[PDB]
Write an enzyme that holds these catalytic residues in place. Structure first.
Site, PDB file in Angstrom:
ATOM      1  N   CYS A 106       1.033  -0.747  -0.062  1.00 52.04           N
ATOM      2  CA  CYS A 106       0.087  -0.182   0.246  1.00 52.04           C
ATOM      3  C   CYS A 106       1.204   1.758  -0.294  1.00 52.04           C
ATOM      4  O   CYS A 106       2.183   1.420   0.862  1.00 52.04           O
ATOM      5  CB  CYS A 106      -1.230   0.033   1.142  1.00 52.04           C
ATOM      6  SG  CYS A 106      -2.128   1.778   1.031  1.00 52.04           S
ATOM      7  N   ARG A 109       0.153   4.417   3.298  1.00 52.29           N
ATOM      8  CA  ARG A 109       0.426   4.185   4.441  1.00 52.29           C
ATOM      9  C   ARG A 109       0.625   5.144   5.142  1.00 52.29           C
ATOM     10  O   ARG A 109       0.571   5.484   6.462  1.00 52.29           O
ATOM     11  CB  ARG A 109       0.696   3.371   4.529  1.00 52.29           C
ATOM     12  CG  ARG A 109       0.669   1.222   4.003  1.00 52.29           C
ATOM     13  CD  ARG A 109       1.521   0.412   4.943  1.00 52.29           C
ATOM     14  NE  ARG A 109       2.675   0.379   3.569  1.00 52.29           N
ATOM     15  CZ  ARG A 109       3.759  -0.032   3.882  1.00 52.29           C
ATOM     16  NH1 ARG A 109       4.058  -0.761   4.841  1.00 52.29           N
ATOM     17  NH2 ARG A 109       3.922  -0.172   2.446  1.00 52.29           N
ATOM     18  N   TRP A 278      -9.000   6.080  -1.119  1.00 50.87           N
ATOM     19  CA  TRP A 278      -9.387   7.447  -1.224  1.00 50.87           C
ATOM     20  C   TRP A 278      -8.227   6.438  -3.093  1.00 50.87           C
ATOM     21  O   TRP A 278      -7.188   5.840  -2.630  1.00 50.87           O
ATOM     22  CB  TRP A 278      -9.248   8.839  -1.774  1.00 50.87           C
ATOM     23  CG  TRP A 278      -8.202   9.377  -0.492  1.00 50.87           C
ATOM     24  CD1 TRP A 278      -6.930   9.608  -1.535  1.00 50.87           C
ATOM     25  CD2 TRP A 278      -7.926   9.762   0.402  1.00 50.87           C
ATOM     26  NE1 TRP A 278      -6.116   9.717  -0.899  1.00 50.87           N
ATOM     27  CE2 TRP A 278      -6.789   9.856   0.947  1.00 50.87           C
ATOM     28  CE3 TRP A 278      -8.269   9.635   1.780  1.00 50.87           C
ATOM     29  CZ2 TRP A 278      -6.603  10.234   1.577  1.00 50.87           C
ATOM     30  CZ3 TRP A 278      -7.800  10.072   2.636  1.00 50.87           C
ATOM     31  CH2 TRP A 278      -6.569  10.076   2.933  1.00 50.87           C
ATOM     32  N   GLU A 283      -4.147   3.659 -10.510  1.00 47.51           N
ATOM     33  CA  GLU A 283      -5.504   2.774 -10.271  1.00 47.51           C
ATOM     34  C   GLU A 283      -6.329   2.831 -11.047  1.00 47.51           C
ATOM     35  O   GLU A 283      -6.700   2.305 -12.080  1.00 47.51           O
ATOM     36  CB  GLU A 283      -5.918   2.946  -8.824  1.00 47.51           C
ATOM     37  CG  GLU A 283      -5.338   3.118  -7.939  1.00 47.51           C
ATOM     38  CD  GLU A 283      -5.333   2.686  -6.495  1.00 47.51           C
ATOM     39  OE1 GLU A 283      -6.093   1.801  -6.488  1.00 47.51           O
ATOM     40  OE2 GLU A 283      -5.536   3.869  -6.189  1.00 47.51           O
TER      41      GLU A 283
END
Ligand code: HEM
Ligand code: HEM
Ligand SMILES: Cc1cc(N)nc(C[C@@H]2CNC[C@@H]2OCCCCCc2ccccn2)c1
Ligand SMILES: Cc1cc(N)nc(C[C@@H]2CNC[C@@H]2OCCCCCc2ccccn2)c1
Ligand SMILES: C[C@H](O)[C@H](O)[C@H]1CNc2nc(N)[nH]c(=O)c2N1
Ligand SMILES: C[C@H](O)[C@H](O)[C@H]1CNc2nc(N)[nH]c(=O)c2N1
Ligand SMILES: [Zn+2]
Lengths: 407, 411
Positions: A106, A109, A278, A283
């Site tokens: 991720c 973070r 979000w 992506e």
């Protein structure tokens, strides 16, 4: 035993000690690296509970205190007699925040401590799950000012009474195979869409059909529920300079909400723990829109730009890719829906990594997932060495329930 | 045992058995993956096993495993090692070894070409002047007036590690970098330390933005010596853009021949510390890394300024827009001058075909995803979606430390 990571752009060297606390296995060995592979009783439970409560009491500077030893005893006694235990609310919040903190894949973070935890461990039915999920969706969406949240349903017991959200994300678009041979909508979701219609759903059979939730409570057969349309914030996609862009008829949803993972805290397993943040713009603009197996729109866009598609070396794909990603960010920003670009997000991750090295002794990170799927080397993360290892509490991927469930 | 890799775009699954022949360690363990870490005198005792493993591979490849010729060669090498403590490769073994080191190079996207490699045997070389001559010949052959041909030149192997041949240059052709008193850099910031060494060794630096460095060549463990590559052998391409007329006035150029000179070639336990090799460029190596890394020529801002992009916010994707135009310019310029270059789309598609073939015919293809995926446009190339297994096969190319840190100056 003590490891260095170097940034090759800045020469900054960091020392990792946190990896010594890693427990689970990577899939790599001394002879083979599996860095690029996507998926590489009472007796086992008490060590796991102890490991966790020790980290928890340490975090609140109460390690070795009477309240620490009393809680270890309380949990031992509870396992000894019930075969499991229940986390305190404070422990649950700490566990969820830390599972995000430990998510090596991720990039977002830096935000890990700002996570709203919704305790849904009192939930018993699928309609109750639907209610909690709507409330999560509405809370997280916050009219476009997105807020990170997780909702945690009851923990696994004997494993025949699992809570599961069958959907891979709370909000996704339906996919349909056509007589034509092509796919309408999102090809990623053809199978799930079929499980939906086979369970009752009246598919509108369009390109951007928000899927119904398929919810499984207490190991029962899953039930269908439509999310109130007014709770699903969607964004029409347009381009700041190209007027024709809007006529592709593209949109995406504002809330990315992963719903198929397993949260492990102190050996307890939470098989339904939808969480949401979000989007980073890539992506949607790179993966959702331009993967060949997804909406695969590069060809249509390149044509509308009238680029030379005769040879790969004209870089027509690369040009069209950048424009699509400009449109995604512009659209979200214009409609006031939280989005982060890949330059911003990766700069924030490098800052987060340095904080974590300074304050925690390391930061597990999976370079293959952290480096954005476009423009890799012009982001700072490309030049950053990362160590990947598995810490708990954690989020784990889990098999699709239809492969598992008995009807 | 069998390991499977999946392609997430095509669902093609491949099965690797070749990893069972891996020897050396990766850096990773069951508890830690070091996949993104850049850097994660032998005894007789180890040497004959390594020679035997290699000769077994070589003789199997020529369909002569267990033949009289194979057995006699094993005996000969064994006897040579016990008598002289090392051994010499036959020319055919050297050629096979160099081609296989390339085939085994898991970070190389260009390996479809591995069997087409011209090997120049320079093991009779004794002096730095002799090295210079061999390297000029390599450059001229490989360059071939723009029709690039892959080549490698192999200087004598390590003996006691006190008599090493080394090319001190990291690549045969590179531009000088000069740190200015005001802290800015003129030319290529990657080469500042090496440029300082050349200057100290007597190089008269022109002090411009694209000065081809001299070769600094060490033979037989002696102090290195400076040589200028004849400029007529150094093919260079001025960079222009097909639509943007102002691109030329940035004054950019690059050299045609990418020629790695600082790696160590290991074949059958023998170590070739000087083995310059060359291929041709993939466009992103220049347009993305050499031109756009912040610590290299760093031209993004200036290009973006000339394009009149909105530079106030990163979310305008100005850097990404300028990056694409620069890479168009590099490919256009090379193609217009008829100098071999491959775009990242072509190269990755060819690599996937190569990898699938290697799985079928060889049982595997070790590949380092971190390096194979191009530094722009990653996921619109087929390698992004391809799972890969990384492991170490010999013969192999390995990194070695820069010689200025280890060299014993004779004076
Ligand atoms: C706040 C905004 C956030 C941003 C910008 C963000 C960014 C991202 C991105 C870009 C990915 C890779 C996605 C992909 O390629 O499919 C990812 C993966 C992941 N993130 Fe985040 N994240 C955010 C919030 C969260 C939260 C709130 C959690 C948990 C509470 C979380 C946990 C994870 C996990 C477990 C993965 C790997 C998922 C998988 O394996 O499929 N993230 N993150
Ligand atoms: C023929 C055209 C070739 C192309 C297009 C090509 C492409 C590339 C690229 C793009 C890289 C990564 C470079 C970087 O990011 O710095 C690379 C690495 C590498 N290639 Fe090739 N290559 C070619 C020929 C060769 C040859 C002839 C050899 C050896 C005989 C070779 C062996 C290697 C090795 C050992 C690496 C890793 C280098 C390192 O660790 O620094 N390649 N290749
Ligand atoms: C086989 C597989 C394994 C795995 N760990 N995860 C997946 C899910 C794939 C991996 N990347 C695309 C897809 O996941 C999409 C959902 C990711 C959203 C992540 C996120 C969460 C929060 C904020 C922003 N983004 C598949
Ligand atoms: C620390 C370090 C380790 C390593 N293995 N290699 C390097 C050299 C780095 C790797 N990427 C940039 C730089 O190498 C530049 C030369 C690579 C050229 C490869 C090539 C060879 C033939 C044809 C096309 N391209 C540094
Ligand atoms: C095979 C490879 O692991 C796979 O395509 C990965 C690469 N990196 C990724 N990175 C992110 N963030 N998300 C992904 O889905 C993937 N897919
Ligand atoms: C830290 C990281 O491993 C490093 O920046 C790598 C990433 N991938 C790369 N890929 C290639 N082809 N060449 C490189 O120099 C690098 N550098
Ligand atoms: Zn690994």
């Amino acid at each position: 035993r003590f490891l260095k990571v170097k940034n090759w752009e800045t020469d900054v060297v960091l020392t990792d000690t946190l990896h010594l606390k890693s427990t689970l296995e990577t899939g790599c060995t001394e002879h083979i690296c599996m860095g690029s592979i996507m998926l590489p009783t009472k007796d086992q439970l008490f060590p796991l509970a102890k490991e966790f409560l020790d980290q928890y009491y340490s975090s609140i500077k109460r390690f070795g205190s009477k309240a620490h030893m009393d809680r270890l005893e309380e949990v031992n006694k509870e396992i000894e007699s019930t075969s499991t235990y229940q986390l305190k609310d404070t422990e649950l919040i700490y566990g969820a925040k830390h599972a995000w903190r430990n998510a090596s894949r991720c990039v977002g973070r830096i935000q890990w401590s700002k996570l709203q935890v919704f305790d849904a461990r009192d939930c018993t039915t699928a309609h109750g799950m639907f209610n909690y999920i709507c409330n999560h969706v509405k809370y997280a969406t916050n009219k476009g000012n997105l807020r990170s949240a997780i909702t945690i349903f009851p923990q696994r017991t004997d494993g025949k009474h699992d809570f599961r959200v069958w959907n891979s994300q709370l909000i996704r678009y339906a996919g349909y195979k056509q007589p034509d041979g092509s796919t309408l909508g999102d090809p990623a979701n053809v199978q799930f869409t079929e499980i939906c219609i086979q369970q009752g759903w009246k598919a509108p059979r369009g390109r951007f059909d928000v899927l119904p939730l398929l919810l499984q409570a207490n190991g029962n057969d899953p039930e269908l529920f439509q999310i109130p349309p007014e709770l699903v914030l969607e964004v029409p996609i347009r381009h700041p300079k190209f007027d024709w862009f809007k006529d592709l008829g593209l949109k995406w949803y504002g809330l990315p909400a992963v719903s198929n993972m397993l949260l492990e805290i102190g050996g307890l397993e939470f098989s339904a723990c939808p969480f949401s943040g979000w989007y980073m713009g890539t992506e949607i603009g790179v993966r959702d829109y331009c993967d060949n197996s997804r909406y695969n729109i590069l060809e249509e866009v390149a044509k509308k730009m009238d680029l030379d598609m005769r040879k790969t070396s004209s870089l027509w794909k690369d040009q069209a890719l950048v424009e699509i990603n400009i449109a995604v960010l512009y659209s979200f920003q214009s409609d006031k829906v939280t989005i982060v670009d890949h330059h911003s997000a990766t700069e924030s991750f490098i800052k987060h990594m340095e904080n974590e090295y300074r304050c925690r002794g390391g930061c597990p990170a999976d370079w293959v997932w952290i480096v954005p799927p476009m423009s890799g080397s012009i982001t700072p993360v490309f030049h950053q060495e990362m160590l990947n290892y598995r810490l708990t509490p954690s989020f784990e991927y889990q098999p699709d329930p239809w492969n598992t469930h008995v009807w």
